[PDB]
Symmetry: C2
Subunit: 212 residues, 2 copies
Amino acid sequence: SFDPFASTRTFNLAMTDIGEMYFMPPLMEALAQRAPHIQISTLRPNAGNLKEDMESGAVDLALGLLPELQTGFFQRRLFRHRYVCMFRKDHPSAKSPMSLKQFTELEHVGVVALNTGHGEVDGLLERAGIKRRMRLVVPHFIAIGPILHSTDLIATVPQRFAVRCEVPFGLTTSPHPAKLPDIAINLFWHAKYNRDPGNMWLRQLFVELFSE
Amino acid sequence: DSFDPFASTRTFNLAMTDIGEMYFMPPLMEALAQRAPHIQISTLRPNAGNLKEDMESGAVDLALGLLPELQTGFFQRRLFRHRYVCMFRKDHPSAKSPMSLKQFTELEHVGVVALNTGHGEVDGLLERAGIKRRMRLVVPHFIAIGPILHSTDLIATVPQRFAVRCEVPFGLTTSPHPAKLPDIAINLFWHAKYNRDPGNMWLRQLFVELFSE
C-alpha cells in the first residue's frame, strides 16, 4: 500500500525547464501537508533513456510533449498553453496586442529548445515567411527573463513561462501575432506502474493540481 | 579577418553554463545594442560537444566558467571569484542571516545536481563535514530555484552571482554560508589560434571590461 503521509519514498519526475519551473513550486506546496516525508527529484527527458528508465521504475512520471512515448505508456493530457510575445513593461516600441508587422520590426532572443515541443516554433515561423532578427540565440529559457528586462529584445515563449516571469522581471506579454499551434502537456506513466499505489497517488495529484 | 563593430554582421559562439548565461547575457546584450548593433550572439553548454576541438577549429569563439579541462593551447583571463550562499525567501519564518551551521541542518533543502560543473561538488563537500541535509527536492539545474524558494520554506546552496539575479525579482534574501565551501573562480577562455584575431580580441575585451571584478 501507499501512505502519502508516512511515505519516505523518492519520486523521480522527468520534465523540461519550462515544466519544472511551472510544476515544482505548486507541487512542493501541496506535498507540504500531504506528504511531508517523501523526496522529489527531477531530470530532463532528454537526460538519458526515458523510455527504458520509466519502464524499470527509475523514472516514475514524465511531463510535456513526448511523441516518442507510444507503446507501453499511458498518457493523461493536462493542459494546453499557447505561444505569447514577451518584452519588458516599459519597452519604447512594443505594444499589446503586438502586430505581425512590428513583430518582424523588432529584434529577438530565440530559444533553440532542441528536442522539445518548443523547438518547433523556429521553423513554423520561417516557413510562414516570418523573418526575424535573432540578435541572440540560447539553448534554454533560464536567462530569457533577465535578458528581456535589460534590453529591447522580444521573445516567443510558452504562456506558462510568462506566468512565472511577468511580475518578477517586470515584463509584458502579448497574444502572438503569428498563427502558432497550441502545445499540449501530458502526464506520462508506464503500464507496469498503472496500478502501483504510489504512482496512482502522485499522478492523481498532478491531475488535481494542473488539469484544465 | 578585420573586425569593425559598427557594421559587422558576424556571429560569435559562446560556451557557458546556465548560471553564466543568466549572468553574462543581459549586460552583454545591453552593451552590444550600443556598440555592435548587427553582430549575433549564440550560446551553448560547455559540455555539449568537443569544446576543445570546437575552440581550435573556431566553431566556438569563447568559453566562460571553471573548465579545468582547458590547459595547453588555451589562453585564460580571470573575471571574478564568488562564494556559495544560502538563499531563502525574505519572509521565511525560520531562516536567519547569518544562518548558523545548526539551523542549516534543521531546515529542508532544495538541491541542484549541477553535474559536470564546479557547483556539483558541493553536496559531497557538505557530507564529508558530517552535515546530512534534508534534501526534500533535487533538480538538475538552477532555473526553477527562484520560483521554488518564493513559494516554499526550502533553502538552497547557490552561487552568489546567481542569487543576485534572483533576490529582487523573486523576493528572496541571502545569508553567508555557515559551511566551509571554497569560492568559485569564473574565467574567460580562448584558443591560442585566435589570440591575434581582431574580432575575438574585441569581444574578449568587452567581457573583461564588463565582468572583471
